Design an enzyme around this catalytic site. Structure first.
Site, PDB file in Angstrom:
ATOM      1  N   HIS B  71      63.148  89.132  68.537  1.00 31.50           N
ATOM      2  CA  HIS B  71      62.155  88.377  68.141  1.00 31.50           C
ATOM      3  C   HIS B  71      62.086  86.302  68.796  1.00 31.50           C
ATOM      4  O   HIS B  71      60.766  86.600  67.884  1.00 31.50           O
ATOM      5  CB  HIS B  71      63.079  88.519  66.523  1.00 31.50           C
ATOM      6  CG  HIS B  71      63.896  87.130  66.639  1.00 31.50           C
ATOM      7  ND1 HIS B  71      65.162  87.438  66.681  1.00 31.50           N
ATOM      8  CD2 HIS B  71      63.361  85.797  65.947  1.00 31.50           C
ATOM      9  CE1 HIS B  71      66.281  86.707  66.943  1.00 31.50           C
ATOM     10  NE2 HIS B  71      65.190  84.985  66.450  1.00 31.50           N
ATOM     11  N   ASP B  95      67.623  93.719  69.521  1.00 29.02           N
ATOM     12  CA  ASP B  95      66.918  92.244  69.006  1.00 29.02           C
ATOM     13  C   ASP B  95      67.963  91.761  69.747  1.00 29.02           C
ATOM     14  O   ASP B  95      67.948  90.101  70.015  1.00 29.02           O
ATOM     15  CB  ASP B  95      67.477  91.377  67.871  1.00 29.02           C
ATOM     16  CG  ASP B  95      65.951  91.193  67.852  1.00 29.02           C
ATOM     17  OD1 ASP B  95      64.952  90.540  68.161  1.00 29.02           O
ATOM     18  OD2 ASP B  95      66.754  89.255  66.167  1.00 29.02           O
ATOM     19  N   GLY B 151      65.923  77.870  66.442  1.00 32.43           N
ATOM     20  CA  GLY B 151      65.584  77.111  67.206  1.00 32.43           C
ATOM     21  C   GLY B 151      67.117  77.981  67.631  1.00 32.43           C
ATOM     22  O   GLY B 151      67.238  77.717  69.039  1.00 32.43           O
ATOM     23  N   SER B 153      68.876  81.008  68.170  1.00 30.60           N
ATOM     24  CA  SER B 153      68.801  82.383  67.861  1.00 30.60           C
ATOM     25  C   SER B 153      69.070  82.176  69.933  1.00 30.60           C
ATOM     26  O   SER B 153      68.329  81.750  70.595  1.00 30.60           O
ATOM     27  CB  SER B 153      68.068  82.869  67.497  1.00 30.60           C
ATOM     28  OG  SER B 153      66.765  82.738  67.956  1.00 30.60           O
TER      29      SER B 153
HETATM   30  C1  LIG Z   1      69.710  93.902  64.922  1.00 35.90           C
HETATM   31  C2  LIG Z   1      68.789  94.568  63.267  1.00 35.90           C
HETATM   32  C3  LIG Z   1      67.817  94.594  63.624  1.00 35.90           C
HETATM   33  N1  LIG Z   1      66.960  95.381  62.188  1.00 35.90           N
HETATM   34  C4  LIG Z   1      67.794  96.952  61.573  1.00 35.90           C
HETATM   35  C5  LIG Z   1      67.656  96.747  60.402  1.00 35.90           C
HETATM   36  C6  LIG Z   1      67.564  97.855  62.690  1.00 35.90           C
HETATM   37  C7  LIG Z   1      66.290  98.291  62.387  1.00 35.90           C
HETATM   38  O1  LIG Z   1      65.006  97.162  62.383  1.00 35.90           O
HETATM   39  N2  LIG Z   1      65.231  98.596  62.123  1.00 35.90           N
HETATM   40  C8  LIG Z   1      63.868  99.563  61.980  1.00 35.90           C
HETATM   41  C9  LIG Z   1      63.830 100.856  62.369  1.00 35.90           C
HETATM   42  N3  LIG Z   1      64.172 100.371  64.176  1.00 35.90           N
HETATM   43  C10 LIG Z   1      66.573  93.977  64.088  1.00 35.90           C
HETATM   44  C11 LIG Z   1      65.904  94.626  65.934  1.00 35.90           C
HETATM   45  C12 LIG Z   1      65.232  93.617  65.828  1.00 35.90           C
HETATM   46  C13 LIG Z   1      64.686  92.829  65.757  1.00 35.90           C
HETATM   47 CL1  LIG Z   1      63.166  91.943  65.982  1.00 35.90          CL
HETATM   48  C14 LIG Z   1      64.340  91.872  64.232  1.00 35.90           C
HETATM   49  O2  LIG Z   1      65.095  90.729  63.365  1.00 35.90           O
HETATM   50  C15 LIG Z   1      63.452  90.309  62.546  1.00 35.90           C
HETATM   51  C16 LIG Z   1      62.547  89.958  62.351  1.00 35.90           C
HETATM   52  C17 LIG Z   1      61.818  89.273  62.019  1.00 35.90           C
HETATM   53  C18 LIG Z   1      60.812  90.913  61.565  1.00 35.90           C
HETATM   54  C19 LIG Z   1      61.537  91.537  61.971  1.00 35.90           C
HETATM   55  C20 LIG Z   1      62.151  91.994  62.231  1.00 35.90           C
HETATM   56  C21 LIG Z   1      66.032  93.118  63.632  1.00 35.90           C
HETATM   57  F1  LIG Z   1      66.412  92.817  62.320  1.00 35.90           F
END
Ligand SMILES: CC[C@@H]([NH2+][C@@H](C)CC(=O)NCC[NH3+])c1ccc(Cl)c(Oc2ccccc2)c1F
Ligand SMILES: CC[C@@H]([NH2+][C@@H](C)CC(=O)NCC[NH3+])c1ccc(Cl)c(Oc2ccccc2)c1F
EC number: 3.4.22.-
Lengths: 642, 645
Positions: B71, B95, B151, B153
């Protein structure tokens, strides 16, 4: 950094379009060199600092913008940094000589009332004029729509210029109207002195005047000049923000001018009968302001100071002095609004690098720079003072922390020492040092009209301004050759203060000086009506309305928040009173809410929240009458800068 | 642009864990280093302070890899001594991204204790005690306002011995107060390091014996929606092909009957056809309207343009993934040319040219010369309906055939055929299938974002933002199709692909309630299946929050809801529900914006303050907060909410 032109707004049977002439890199480099050779075109420039983007409008060969955006900065130019030709802090107006290529708009004269505002997005917003400086939007817009448009022109239908946009007037975050700097304030500004000499104390006028005195500390503004007036037979009150300074004037004036003056502070009073009296602003306020006929001359020293006690104190002087028989108020400072820090002949200024054993705000201090001698390191927070003093002590360097709440005897006064201090030093302690090492940051409080449910008073760390830098640096160089070490050459615009300070004025009025909200307003209005003093937004009615609804405070809770010495004792104890009487918990159990600790066993449910003075950990209810009252106050017209 | 190291956080090597920062770079140095990608400075320390042009965060070296959050970094390279360093690991699902640590950096190493006493290291070099609560969660000993953690993460969580337990990725907040921290666990890093750096998804999977979900990452033109369904059907399987767009859905079907022989079933609002063929083409919308997976009907379900983050796609894909096994399918294919973490690379058929300030037509602070568009067929992407009308007008003044296209307007206003300059929002891509001589791109789009503003509840804000790798690739894709093409652009900036805002989850619940007769609990089942599926676009897990919100929105006025549905604006359910509460209280809507047009006829009887439930735009009227639904939604804001830091 210089302000930097980054685009332009091209006007036309009124239409507009934008062009961007510089990207981020270009903008940064040009800001630093201050050398810009790109072609300049159009009446409206899009300009930027590193922190902010806004507009500038050329009129009568001058490129005008807002002081709140540009401060006192140079404009990047073809032959290098262009110094401001005009700096009018009182009108939120600054001006540079337009470089070749820039075209001007001509003043609107016909005097139309259908106006058009040109934004940085090149929209053309119809406005209906009302007063000299206000216009109502035909279609209310969210305030975010106008941000970045400060400095943009208000045009009449002919396309001539009425003025420049400076601020929105908001109702619950919706811009209903706009504040502008009219073209007549520009003309006035163009005829004001190249350099007004303010270094001469004025002679006593036949009738009441308010005079400014700009001169350094050690100049004698607060010692030599009171004595001089005293020799001529005048009675003179000298007001100062520092308890330590004020007490210090007694032995100094006795020895040096054969005057053993009256001395007035919260912690000590001396009455000698002398015709000269030194007092803090706070003690002046506690004594009830101007004594009928007591003084001919009132010298408001350090009148650049923007703590709430100084503001209300000076406001009180300006509302009360003429009626009390005084002939002359002197607003004295070495750093008036709009000032910038210039080199000091007796102070060598050296940037910290990353070489050194002691980490400091991302840089480093060499131990050899502080191992012996007497040195002052300014940190922004208590916690940073404690950690740095511990580190230094651990190396066996004699080091002590000083900040608000410590007794000043933590000193020493003589012998090797590294004092690690906050700005509390500048009022608790009068001495000088061999060097000052400056973090170049400070803590300030800011109001956010956050509507969650009402307002928030937030503590934030910000870059220092020209007044902070000059006053911190000035703790070295007086009668010794000094060294000023710094983390960053940054420097925010001087002379502006937050609406949260106005809020503190009403808080202190209520908590300390038995003032009704309305009497505080009268005094602050007198301050607001006075050019050359620091500037703020006009939020007097709004804050008056908030405090007006805060009735039947619990005396006991108030006495405890006063005794504890933290900020906003009235608002804290007033929240505490609401909580206690609703039998509900405070927003959290941080030490702010400690007057309630004895009631912790019996307090339950959601907090009847009035406003946010920190983190809110508990659940909130909005049902309390006072909360509903304060929410209705949020509908007041509020100036906000764009 | 590259990520740039601008400082470091030095950790004590003995005694109780402490830290200090060193700044190594100014703003000018940072921008130059990000542009060149060449960073001469030797690195030191294990925790780096990093910055792009838009933000600053941390990266922590562990086991020779400098790790941080997707992110923050997206897929960006790291400025390095010999030039830009590409990511060794790009784990969007977790992430987590990683670059091989350059010479100079020390690394932390994983813990061996298993201690539950943790320490979080922040960008200001604070060391914050944290109690481990699960695999990836820890509770703060002292809850903190969330802004304190922003800031930070990419920062490490340390065991008491100074070794690494993981890297910080998000605050768990309760009404703006961080009470706990979410982190990527160090064992996820170790697994990643012990696993392949490259995985193959370039070709359609063999049909397995038993149910599988597979990814298909293949360019447009490889015939993901024509060739590959045909190939499967040629083997005797029944195939369902889902696409966001009606026009593409009908285009694929027609193509198949012409070129691949088969006259397929078509399922869309405007045109439905049952031929009995073993291939069916359908929108995701029609699929949900039909109630999802019809038992025993398909062997393979190709979820095409599975990168799309409109709410119909997400809800549709979640549905397929919750239902396909049970309905008797063997294979779900998640197909896209631009999967999450992908980046726009050069295309041979398309010449790309920066727009300059030279030209007669102002355009997003730059210019288009008439030369570039006066002859031929061109496409110009604008971000807003407004700017499409003002550019089309400014173009048709100069003797140019210019037709604007957006949501609300109808296709067939686009000359087929003739000389033309369509000026359009991204609605063009679901509406129209044709290609162009060139594309001129403003490189910005409009998106919705939720703010948990507590004023009194939440706000859905419409904002303009820089495009991502998906938006760029798709806008550029309307030229260079089997022929020469020109792509002109205002800006090279390209933000990270594959992430979507919590507002879209809201929109899924809204759509479930408005269009597909799903209860919030039912929507949660479908969205859970989506969130549990790696390789699909990523979002924050705000499902319990959003389900709790819609669960209280009962007994909506059906007439208002039918009007906001037909009007086609976003959040038809939330709009109609505020309208409902308003009318029943005889109160005005929050404003007289077109959003509230279903209430205009009632204008003369509505009075007093609006019982505000949430903010969907400017609120001009006075408001009251005493409505039970407002109180309910306020209670829902006490939910545990992940917010990234
Ligand atoms: C590590 C947590 C992950 N989110 C979970 C709910 C998994 C997920 O996204 N599943 C969807 C289908 N694949 C996650 C992964 C990447 C990012 Cl960049 C995350 O945080 C954000 C923050 C803001 C907007 C979008 C994602 C994230 F939570
Ligand atoms: C142009 C209006 C002026 N404010 C008036 C209330 C006058 C005033 O400040 N009186 C104080 C006594 N000298 C004004 C002038 C300058 C600026 Cl920069 C203004 O805006 C801000 C904005 C934010 C913080 C402080 C001042 C301003 F309102």
């Amino acid at each position: 950094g210089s302000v930097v032109i980054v685009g332009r707004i091209i006007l036309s049977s009124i239409t507009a379009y934008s062009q961007q002439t510089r990207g981020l890199l270009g903008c940064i480099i040009t800001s630093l060199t201050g050398r810009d050779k790109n072609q300049v075109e159009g009446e409206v420039q899009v300009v930027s600092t590193a922190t902010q983007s806004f507009l500038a409008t050329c009129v009568n060969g001058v490129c005008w913008t807002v002081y709140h955006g540009a401060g006192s900065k140079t404009l990047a130019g073809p032959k290098g940094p262009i110094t401001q030709m005009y700096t009018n802090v009182d009108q939120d107006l600054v001006g540079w000589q337009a470089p070749p290529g820039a075209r001007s708009l001509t003043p609107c004269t016909c005097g139309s009332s259908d106006l058009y505002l040109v934004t940085r997005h090149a929209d053309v917003i119809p406005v209906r004029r009302r007063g000299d400086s206000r216009g109502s939007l035909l279609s209310p817009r969210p305030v975010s729509y106008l941000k970045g448009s400060s400095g943009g022109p208000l045009l009449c239908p002919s396309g001539h210029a009425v003025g420049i946009f400076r601020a929105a007037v908001c109702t619950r975050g919706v811009a209903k109207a706009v504040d502008f700097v009219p073209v007549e304030s520009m003309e006035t500004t163009m005829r004001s002195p190249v350099f007004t000499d303010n270094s001469s104390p004025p002679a006593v006028p036949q009738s009441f005047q308010v005079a400014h005195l700009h001169a350094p500390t050690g100049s004698g503004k607060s010692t030599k000049v009171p004595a001089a007036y005293a020799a001529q037979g005048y009675k003179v009150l000298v007001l100062n923000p520092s308890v330590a300074a004020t007490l210090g004037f007694g032995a100094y004036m006795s020895k040096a001018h054969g005057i053993d003056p009256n001395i007035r502070t919260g912690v000590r009073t001396i009455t000698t009968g002398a015709p000269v009296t030194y007092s803090t602003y706070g003690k002046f306020l506690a004594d009830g302001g101007c004594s009928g006929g007591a003084y001919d001359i009132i010298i408001c020293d350090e009148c650049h100071s923007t703590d709430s006690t100084t503001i209300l104190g000076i406001g009180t002087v300006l509302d009360q002095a003429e009626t009390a028989g005084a002939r002359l108020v002197v607003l004295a400072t070495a750093t008036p609004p709009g000032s910038v820090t210039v080199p000091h002949p007796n102070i060598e200024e050296v940037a910290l690098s990353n070489t050194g054993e002691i980490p400091f705000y991302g840089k480093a201090i060499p131990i050899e720079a502080i191992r012996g001698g007497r040195h002052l390191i300014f940190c922004h927070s208590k916690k940073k003072c404690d950690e740095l003093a511990a580190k230094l002590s651990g190396l066996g360097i004699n080091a002590v922390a000083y900040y608000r709440g410590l007794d000043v005897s933590v000193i020493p006064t003589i012998g090797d020492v590294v004092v690690v201090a906050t700005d509390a030093l500048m009022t608790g302690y009068t001495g000088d040092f061999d060097s000052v090492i400056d973090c170049n940051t400070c803590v300030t409080q800011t109001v956010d009209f956050s509507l969650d449910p009402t307002f928030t008073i937030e503590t934030t760390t910000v870059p220092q301004d020209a007044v902070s830098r000059s006053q911190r640096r000035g703790r070295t160089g007086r009668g010794r050759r000094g060294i000023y070490r710094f983390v960053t050459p940054g420097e925010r615009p001087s002379g502006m203060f937050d609406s949260s300070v106005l809020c503190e004025c009403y808080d202190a009025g209520c908590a300390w000086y038995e003032l009704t909200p309305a009497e505080t307003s009268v005094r602050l209005r007198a301050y607001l009506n006075t050019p050359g003093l620091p500037v703020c937004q006009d939020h007097l009615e709004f804050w008056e309305s908030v405090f007006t609804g805060l009735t039947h405070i619990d005396a006991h809770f108030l006495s405890q928040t006063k005794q504890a010495g933290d900020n906003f004792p009235y608002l804290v104890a007033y929240q505490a009173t609401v909580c206690a009487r609703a039998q509900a918990p405070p927003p959290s159990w941080d030490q702010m809410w400690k007057c309630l600790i004895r009631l912790k066993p019996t307090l339950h449910g959601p907090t009847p929240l009035l406003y946010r003075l920190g983190a809110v950990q508990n659940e909130v209810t909005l049902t309390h009458p006072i909360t509903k009252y304060i929410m209705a106050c949020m509908s007041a017209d509020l100036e906000v800068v764009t």
